[PDB]
Amino acid sequence: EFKEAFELFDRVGDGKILYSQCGDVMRALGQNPTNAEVLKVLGNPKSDELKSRRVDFETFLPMLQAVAKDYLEGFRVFDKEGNGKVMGAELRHVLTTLGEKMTEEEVETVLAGHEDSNGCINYEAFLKHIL
Amino acid sequence: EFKEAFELFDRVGDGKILYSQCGDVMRALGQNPTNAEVLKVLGNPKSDELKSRRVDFETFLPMLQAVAKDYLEGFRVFDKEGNGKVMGAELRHVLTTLGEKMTEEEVETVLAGHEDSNGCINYEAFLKHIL
Amino acid sequence: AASELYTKYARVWIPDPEEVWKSAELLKDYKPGDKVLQLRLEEGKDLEYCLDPKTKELPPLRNPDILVGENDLTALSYLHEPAVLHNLKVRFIDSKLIYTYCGIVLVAINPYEQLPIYGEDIINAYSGQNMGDMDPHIFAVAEEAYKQMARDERNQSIIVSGESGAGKTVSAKYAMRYFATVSGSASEANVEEKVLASNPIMESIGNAKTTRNDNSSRFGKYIEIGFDKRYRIIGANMRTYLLEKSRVVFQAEEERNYHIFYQLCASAALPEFKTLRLGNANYFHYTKQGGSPVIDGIDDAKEMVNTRQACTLLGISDSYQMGIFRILAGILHLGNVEFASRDSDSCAIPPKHDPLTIFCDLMGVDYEEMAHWLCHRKLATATETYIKPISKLHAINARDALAKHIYANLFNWIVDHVNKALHSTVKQHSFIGVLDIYGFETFEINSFEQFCINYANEKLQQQFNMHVFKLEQEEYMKEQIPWTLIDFYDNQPCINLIEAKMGVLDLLDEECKMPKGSDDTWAQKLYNTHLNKCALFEKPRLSNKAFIIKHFADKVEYQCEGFLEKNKDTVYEEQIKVLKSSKKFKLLPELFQKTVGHQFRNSLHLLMETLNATTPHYVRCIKPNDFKFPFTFDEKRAVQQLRACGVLETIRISAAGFPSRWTYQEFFSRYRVLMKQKDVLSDRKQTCKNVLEKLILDKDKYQFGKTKIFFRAGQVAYLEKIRADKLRAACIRIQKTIRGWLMRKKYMRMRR
Amino acid sequence: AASELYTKYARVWIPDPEEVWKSAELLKDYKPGDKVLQLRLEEGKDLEYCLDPKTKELPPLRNPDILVGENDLTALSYLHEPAVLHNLKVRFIDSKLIYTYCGIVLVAINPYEQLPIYGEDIINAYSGQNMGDMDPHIFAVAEEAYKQMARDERNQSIIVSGESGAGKTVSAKYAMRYFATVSGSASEANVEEKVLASNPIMESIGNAKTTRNDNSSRFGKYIEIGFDKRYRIIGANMRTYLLEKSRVVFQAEEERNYHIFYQLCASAALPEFKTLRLGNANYFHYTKQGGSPVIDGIDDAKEMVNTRQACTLLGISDSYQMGIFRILAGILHLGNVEFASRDSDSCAIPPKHDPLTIFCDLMGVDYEEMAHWLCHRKLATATETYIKPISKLHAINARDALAKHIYANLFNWIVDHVNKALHSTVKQHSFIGVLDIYGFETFEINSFEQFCINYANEKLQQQFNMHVFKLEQEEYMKEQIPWTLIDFYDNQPCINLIEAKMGVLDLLDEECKMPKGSDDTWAQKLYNTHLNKCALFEKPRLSNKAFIIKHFADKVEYQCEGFLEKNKDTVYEEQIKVLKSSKKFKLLPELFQKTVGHQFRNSLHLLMETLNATTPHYVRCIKPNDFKFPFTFDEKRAVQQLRACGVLETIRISAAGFPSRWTYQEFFSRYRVLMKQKDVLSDRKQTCKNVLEKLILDKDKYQFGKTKIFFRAGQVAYLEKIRADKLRAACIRIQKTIRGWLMRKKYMRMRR
Numbered sequence A, B: 001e002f003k004e005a006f007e008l009f010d011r012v013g014d015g016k017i018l019y020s021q022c023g024d025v026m027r028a029l030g031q032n033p034t035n036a037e038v039l040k041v042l043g044n045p046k047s048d049e050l051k052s053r054r055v056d057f058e059t060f061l062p063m064l065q066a067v068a069k070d071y072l073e074g075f076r077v078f079d080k081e082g083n084g085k086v087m088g089a090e091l092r093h094v095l096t097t098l099g100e101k102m103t104e105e106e107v108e109t110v111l112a113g114h115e116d117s118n119g120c121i122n123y124e125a126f127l128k129h130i131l
Numbered sequence C, D: 001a002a003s004e005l006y007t008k009y010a011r012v013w014i015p016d017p018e019e020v021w022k023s024a025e026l027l028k029d030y031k032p033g034d035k036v037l038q039l040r041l042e043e044g045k046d047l048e049y050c051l052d053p054k055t056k057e058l059p060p061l062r063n064p065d066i067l068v069g070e071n072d073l074t075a076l077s078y079l080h081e082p083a084v085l086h087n088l089k090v091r092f093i094d095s096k097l098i099y100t101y102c103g104i105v106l107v108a109i110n111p112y113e114q115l116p117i118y119g120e121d122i123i124n125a126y127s128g129q130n131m132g133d134m135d136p137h138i139f140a141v142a143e144e145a146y147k148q149m150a151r152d153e154r155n156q157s158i159i160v161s162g163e164s165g166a167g168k169t170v171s172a173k174y175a176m177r178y179f180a181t182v183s184g185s186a187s188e189a190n191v192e193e194k195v196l197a198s199n200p201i202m203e204s205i206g207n208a209k210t211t212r213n214d215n216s217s218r219f220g221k222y223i224e225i226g227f228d229k230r231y232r233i234i235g236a237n238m239r240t241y242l243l244e245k246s247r248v249v250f251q252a253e254e255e256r257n258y259h260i261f262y263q264l265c266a267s268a269a270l271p272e273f274k275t276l277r278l279g280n281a282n283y284f285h286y287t288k289q290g291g292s293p294v295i296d297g298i299d300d301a302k303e304m305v306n307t308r309q310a311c312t313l314l315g316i317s318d319s320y321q322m323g324i325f326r327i328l329a330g331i332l333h334l335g336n337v338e339f340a341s342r343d344s345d346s347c348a349i350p351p352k353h354d355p356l357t358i359f360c361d362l363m364g365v366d367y368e369e370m371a372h373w374l375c376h377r378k379l380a381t382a383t384e385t386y387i388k389p390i391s392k393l394h395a396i397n398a399r400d401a402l403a404k405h406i407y408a409n410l411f412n413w414i415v416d417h418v419n420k421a422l423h424s425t426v427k428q429h430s431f432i433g434v435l436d437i438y439g440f441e442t443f444e445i446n447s448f449e450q451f452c453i454n455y456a457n458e459k460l461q462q463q464f465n466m467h468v469f470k471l472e473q474e475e476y477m478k479e480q481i482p483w484t485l486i487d488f489y490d491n492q493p494c495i496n497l498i499e500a501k502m503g504v505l506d507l508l509d510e511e512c513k514m515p516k517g518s519d520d521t522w523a524q525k526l527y528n529t530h531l532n533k534c535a536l537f538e539k540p541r542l543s544n545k546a547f548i549i550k551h552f553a554d555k556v557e558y559q560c561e562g563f564l565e566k567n568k569d570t571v572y573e574e575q576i577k578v579l580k581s582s583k584k585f586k587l588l589p590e591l592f593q594k595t596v597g598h599q600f601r602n603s604l605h606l607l608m609e610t611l612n613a614t615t616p617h618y619v620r621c622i623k624p625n626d627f628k629f630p631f632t633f634d635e636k637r638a639v640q641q642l643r644a645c646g647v648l649e650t651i652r653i654s655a656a657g658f659p660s661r662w663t664y665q666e667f668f669s670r671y672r673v674l675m676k677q678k679d680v681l682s683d684r685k686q687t688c689k690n691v692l693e694k695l696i697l698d699k700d701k702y703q704f705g706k707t708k709i710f711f712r713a714g715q716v717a718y719l720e721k722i723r724a725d726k727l728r729a730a731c732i733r734i735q736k737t738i739r740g741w742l743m744r745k746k747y748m749r750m751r752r
């Protein structure tokens, strides 16, 4: 299963996916690391190496296992009343400006259809959808 | 002069630059249109055509001439005291969130070295630098 | 009403049968003169929405979600009916918040669920705090009245309004509880415990299960809490209004008589009550008619214990209590007295009739005498008197009249004796009065009872409207803006139709003194005097026996049937004389030592005299559903209730006046960007004037005050719109220049 | 002092010789116990900055740029010396704003440029407005004192302080001008015009060009403006202090005598002044010493016209004015009197000496008599009197003593007659007093003059410090937080050293009555009494003729030389008797109808008695550069001046106390995100207490009030930091989950 994934991300033929693609692959296989957590295991390089160096599935397996060793409490922080809802506009703002910033498009993709007519998201059901 | 420019932006060989590159070329030759002004002359297409269709220097010349027929008053709007200065942090915020939004990198490129130690830009000298 | 705000993506509210309003979004700019709007709904995709010409109005704008659900409405962009409904609903359903400030009033929505916000810890939390520093709560209103009493050196009143089941009595009791805690012990006399003990006594004799409320108050109460010069409680005095006497002898399906009758019947087996010869509640005609002897969750026997304990605390001796219970049991036995008809105009009580025998033992009167006057009447022409028999039907109605009269006088005796127990020997320095009375009511069939209630409500509404006006007038006068720009709702024309000479009540009294006067001749008198001559009086199109009054809340059709009889409230004097002459039962004669309409007019006048000399504080209770369901909200019923307590009209007035108020400093700081450098003077106030006159040409839209600019609705929103436009355009000018520069640099790099 | 705020990218202020402080930025987190900080400057790249142990303190944190330059300092994150300096400098240089509020005081920085903010239009703009709704201005202080007078039913004072050239007199005159406009006409008596006309009179006789100020006040003035019961001006009364008598007879290079002498000499050719026999200003010894007869932009002849017009408005007749000018011209001629020495102990005036002849004509006295007593003294042992000749040097000094004495008495006569013209026949209902007096001063050489000034300043500082304390104590008492947590600066030990029994002034008076008493014996008396026995008294290490006092602003070394002679202020009685005996010149004898230190102590006591019974309002003027340059600011001199008026210490105290004050509602609303659901009670106040005790373990850092939490410096900033951390971590958790989901969807798409 892990092999069928690694091969699909090689877009050249050298039996190797790019360094910047390593996070994308771990997430494809069901892991949820932060950008800094993947940048730890991959040497913490500069902008030169991220868009150049390449690694094989043999040298990539000890990274996938390294990352593989609640989420509801994250959402509950932006629930200002404790009432099971968060404002989608506040969630769009913080996801695009705080932490490991996401683009407008990425957030718009995951949030579309989950906002009610008062601008609220019922986050227990949203969390189960994104798991 | 205009011909030497158009050729440099053709990255294929068909004697034609992409549709999305048309704005970039007009600006290279000294014009300052808005994204909507260039999207007017280029048919106002969808995301399909912008990354597909191509045009020649013969069919591109009537667009360059169309666009070719003060800036200080724009800056003076964000000068809250009328004192010849604007706050670089306010300028970063509005340039990346209002109007035709620019990326963090684009704004960081143009603004680097122009902010003093109190976070202010003397905008008459900044404007002459970007002209 | 500013059309420039109706741009693409702008959210509005439009009509909807099921939820009153529903949200919609513009898919295109409104251009002036457009006949429709292009809207997207939640469900059913798109819609072409017709704007009515002549009355050319656009639909109300939605407030941004971020502004919705605050503790008051002071920071809303747009104030209107949909905004108020939406703010209340969101707070109630999404957040389980029942209390919200709306202008000067506290809105209280009945949760039908016990909430943990009324303990002594919360009373202490509200004590010594500013209302603006605390979440809305009934305790905050009580605290503000307590503090205002000392600070203004004026007496205060708390007026609690709402439909039956809305929460008036619960709110009034929490207010009293608050005062008892924070301003306690003027002495060791346990004053506060005694004031509080009046509650269970009054509820036992004045409350009953109706279909709308298991504990409905069938009387209005004003209680004046007295304070000494150190603002400590020293006692209280209570006045009552509009006791529902009819309930003593009649109940509709699912309804009970007054609670005390069921407390008594549930205690029938107590040794001390042996001589009362009580059956259970299904045994008596006067308690069984509803088919509902028990209330879910109420133990009537245990409530009797509480009632007696309260009576003892308020100094009603064991023998006076036994007397009260003898009279109550007597009323029950009286209801079981049966008549046998002899012919169409005469009747008799059967020999050895146990219910009468028991009644006469309990009341200390003679069977023979009572039997006779239950079946005969004494008439009186000018010259002489005589005695006639009466029909079974008339005997039954007269018997019920007696039962009602006994109860009403027992009620008044208890209130009087409660007042004696709560009386201070030293005159109060100040007071806070609490009023808990019937809200505006209308049913399919409205009669004299509803008429009196709605009259009281016009007077109370008038106080409210005038209080709000006086506060508003003071704000305009401080700013030197003409107070003649202020609108207010005038209840006085309705009040005149009801209470002035030749009005409805005066004509009723005049018809009542005519021998041949009837409901039918009275109706014609109403028409002769008022039809086509008072804009607030109408006649139904298919009836000659009803009239319509345009009240503040709605038009109400009243049926004339029974108005004269209810106004007269006749009881056979000979029957009363028998009870009065009781020889060895001390309490009974103590009960019997103008028309109803005239007496009510006088008592209402005395209440208003008291209330008008106080500063009032308003609590508007809302019953959010008709089935006692926990946290369940119906929009139509909510809006109906907000109309019926005057809130929607208050809000309309505020919104249509000058709701936005900015200092010149605030205005200059925010809208300097809209000004040419040439117009900026050293005099900032003069700058704002010069600039605003150019930005908004219609001088109807704002007024220049001493320290502030007052703006009509939508004007600040318009200025915010053109401010954003200015910032957007300036930002785009800078952006295009930077994009040009960036590309010139990239082009030099690829060249090299 | 919260180390957790010193993270990478955090901006601080560190010491710098040229600008007092300079900005720096952390390139790495401070870890507890670190001996240095890693900093990037503006110029010179990086730096290793040593933190002094023992006194382990980190450098002050910079406020975010967005918070800098507001009208007051109430919204700053960090309050300290660098923040105040920076806020004042930015407002002054970047925005040409000279007025700023700093706590309860108005700071006014001298622009040395005319600004268009003082016209009648601006006076009207400040009238009837709240201080908080207007930009800082001297008119706002005057308006607040005017309103407080009526609202508190108390008298007020405006105390204006600062170095010479800072703007005291300009500020005081704008305050008076404000009062004259907004509370005018109590009658047709033109009261306000008369009060204002006192200004040019007092400036002509009491002001002079010094090196620091072309229009320096060489006296202190308290002017009490009187109001009737409708708060209209009815007049005024003026007291003066510390007139610089020495200037009459001496000027340093570039300095002039009092303005009036140059007004007179410039008018020498006027027909009415023929008998004054005046030369130009270079002709007289008493006006020529500075080599500066003219002031740039001042026309002395035109100023004379203005002075005479003012005198006429205040009821000084033409003949009394001519008398004033006769006496002034007499003083000038007296200064040109020359003595020829006969031997080491005798002198004479030459025959037919024109300056004496003219003096004697002007003063109406006999040449023979005046000549004799200018060259002889009358001594007096216990038994008998006798007459001795005096040396030329002693004659010169006695002649100057006479000139000074004449001028000081003429000055007092004019003040008295100004007071008569401004006196109301009806006693004032209330008053506002305006004080314009020398600020704290120290030079390389300090003498008796500086000592008296700095004494006055300790008393005025004490009033200020106690006023601030009383206001603070009231804030703590309202919140039921112990007021013993408040710090204040105590001027009383310095004051005792100066004015108490056995103190500096008492010892000076005692030495002055001893025949053999001298500056040298006095110095030894000071040492005997105070050296090593008062922590505020020191002796210089290389001098036996000087002493040091630790004043509120700095240590000041005073030279003893001349203290006894200045305290005595001796004038030869026989010389005065000649002038007093003038037979046909009415004004002159009117001028002559305790030590200086004793008289000053008494007059200062009387001033403080008046001021202590008012509510004071403070204006702190700052002279931003030493060369009268338009909008030019020097940081070192600015900080020096903020110390010398007590502002830096006030700010230090406030910052080290409890500067952050939040309601429980504000705290709960902001920091709810820091709380576990289990800790949230219905009692929100109790929740905040429980939670705060866990978030900040050190109970020294906050106090729980009745309605508010009080926090020491840095605590809210720390809570803001951990709040941001909480939000960041929660946001990252959501982000990583969404990134995972997005990639799982993309991977399913490429699979298919």
Ligand SMILES: Nc1ncnc2c1ncn2[C@@H]1O[C@H](COP(=O)(O)OP(=O)(O)O)[C@@H](O)[C@H]1O
Pocket (backbone or CB within 6 Å): C110, C111, C112, C113, C114, C115, C162, C163, C164, C165, C166, C167, C168, C169, C170, C171, C213, C215, C216, C217, C621
């Ligand atoms: N604040 C409240 N909390 C819980 N239940 C309430 C509250 N207010 C009203 N109720 C419920 O509604 C019932 C009717 O309220 P009540 O005050 O008797 O109405 P009203 O006097 O307006 O007719 C109460 O007996 C109680 O069951």
Ligand SMILES: Nc1ncnc2c1ncn2[C@@H]1O[C@H](COP(=O)(O)OP(=O)(O)O)[C@@H](O)[C@H]1O
Pocket (backbone or CB within 6 Å): D110, D111, D112, D113, D114, D115, D162, D163, D164, D165, D166, D167, D168, D169, D170, D171, D213, D215, D216, D217, D621
């Ligand atoms: N607000 C001001 N605007 C313009 N010039 C000022 C202002 N304040 C002070 N000055 C200038 O500074 C000079 C000295 O001010 P002044 O009030 O006489 O100082 P002080 O009484 O403190 O010694 C003034 O004569 C004027 O030239």
Ligand code: BEF
Pocket (backbone or CB within 6 Å): C162, C163, C164, C165, C166, C168, C169, C213, C215, C216, C217, C218, C438, C439
């Ligand atoms: F039934 Be509620 F007391 F109006």
Ligand code: BEF
Pocket (backbone or CB within 6 Å): D162, D163, D164, D165, D166, D168, D169, D213, D215, D216, D217, D218, D438, D439
């Ligand atoms: F020279 Be200023 F009057 F102190």
Ligand SMILES: [Mg+2]
Pocket (backbone or CB within 6 Å): C168, C169, C170, C215, C216, C217, C436
């Ligand atoms: Mg009730």
Ligand SMILES: [Mg+2]
Pocket (backbone or CB within 6 Å): D168, D169, D170, D215, D216, D217, D436
């Ligand atoms: Mg001065």
